Amino acid sequence: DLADRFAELERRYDARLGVYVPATGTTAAIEYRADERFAFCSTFKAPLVAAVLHQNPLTHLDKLITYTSDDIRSISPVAQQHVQTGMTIGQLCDAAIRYSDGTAANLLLADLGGPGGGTAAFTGYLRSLGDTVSRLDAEEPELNRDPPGDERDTTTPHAIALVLQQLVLGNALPPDKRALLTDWMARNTTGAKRIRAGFPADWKVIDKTGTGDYGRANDIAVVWSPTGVPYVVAVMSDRAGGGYDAEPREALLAEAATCVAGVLA
Numbered sequence: 001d002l003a004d005r006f007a008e009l010e011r012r013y014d015a016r017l018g019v020y021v022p023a024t025g026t027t028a029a030i031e032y033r034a035d036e037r038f039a040f041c042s043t044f045k046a047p048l049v050a051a052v053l054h055q056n057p058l059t060h061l062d063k064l065i066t067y068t069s070d071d072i073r074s075i076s077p078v079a080q081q082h083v084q085t086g087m088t089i090g091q092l093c094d095a096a097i098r099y100s101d102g103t104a105a106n107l108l109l110a111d112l113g114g115p116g117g118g119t120a121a122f123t124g125y126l127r128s129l130g131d132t133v134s135r136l137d138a139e140e141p142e143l144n145r146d147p148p149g150d151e152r153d154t155t156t157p158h159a160i161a162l163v164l165q166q167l168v169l170g171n172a173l174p175p176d177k178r179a180l181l182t183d184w185m186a187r188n189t190t191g192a193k194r195i196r197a198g199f200p201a202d203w204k205v206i207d208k209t210g211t212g213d214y215g216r217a218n219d220i221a222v223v224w225s226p227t228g229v230p231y232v233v234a235v236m237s238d239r240a241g242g243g244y245d246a247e248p249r250e251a252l253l254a255e256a257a258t259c260v261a262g263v264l265a
């Protein structure tokens with residue numbers, strides 16, 4: 001039984017696990033703690049890129065953004081190298097999704113603009129997609145640090161799955177912008193040990209991970225079966241029992257995804 005298996009994983013990893021897969025044509029929704037809040041961590045970067053894409057002409061991707069030493073405040077594998085040159089909006093989107101670059105995310109939030117350095121406009125974008133649950137309150141690095149249970153900077157597996165479904169499978173974005181987002185998620189470098197690890201090789205997986213304090217490890221994905229049937233998979237986890245420095249456990253997400261894949265096969 002799936003709920004029993006997910007509970008077993010919680011005990012194995014001393015973790016809290018949330019899973020949602022929306023209903024499709026012939027499969028019921030899969031849900032485990034799906035309406036409980038979990039920190040976004042870096043998973044917000046996927047809808048952030050969608051918001052920036054939606055807000056601007058496509059060739060806004062070519063606008064050069066400059067930034068300085070004091071902008072590097074979080075894990076930023078790409079932006080750390082480009083303080084002198086700057087990065088275009090398209091380079092920032094690429095880095096935010098594929099390398100989970102925190103500075104890139106902060107600069108994209110500032111591009112979106114408005115109160116809270118763009119966090120309010122990001123939340124507004126989610127509201128426009130019918131998500132009345134999620135909220136972004138801080139930027140990097142603070143957004144990963146809220147204590148367990150705090151509602152700041154949270155989504156739920158259910159809410160983020162429905163947002164991702166609209167972005168990738170629905171009509172939230174026009175086809176050209178949709179393809180940009182999908183391709184960046186398809187080319188993600190950070191997700192091999194999470195949802196990808198749970199699905200057979202002949203299933204396509206595109207994803208955005210998140211990792212944070214209190215042992216937080218998330219992954220949001222769209223998967224496609226070998227015959228082109230898509231499913232959205234959101235897995236979120238934390239480990240409050242280990243305190244602030246608890247190790248995130250990718251293995252928990254790989255096991256949870258393996259269980260989901262067995263149901264979807």
Ligand SMILES: *C(=O)[C@@H]([C@@H]1NC(C(=O)O)=C(S[C@@H]2CN[C@H](C(=O)Nc3cccc(C(=O)O)c3)C2)[C@@H]1C)[C@@H](C)O
Nearest residue numbers: 041042075100102144190209210211212247248249250
């Ligand atoms: C956003 O959440 C966050 C950055 N994003 C991600 C992410 O996974 O998307 C990370 S983590 C980074 C990429 N994958 C590696 C990883 O998962 N390492 C890992 C996994 C499990 C345990 C450990 C450990 O205990 O050391 C390490 C590393 C990155 C933090 C920022 C922008 O806030």
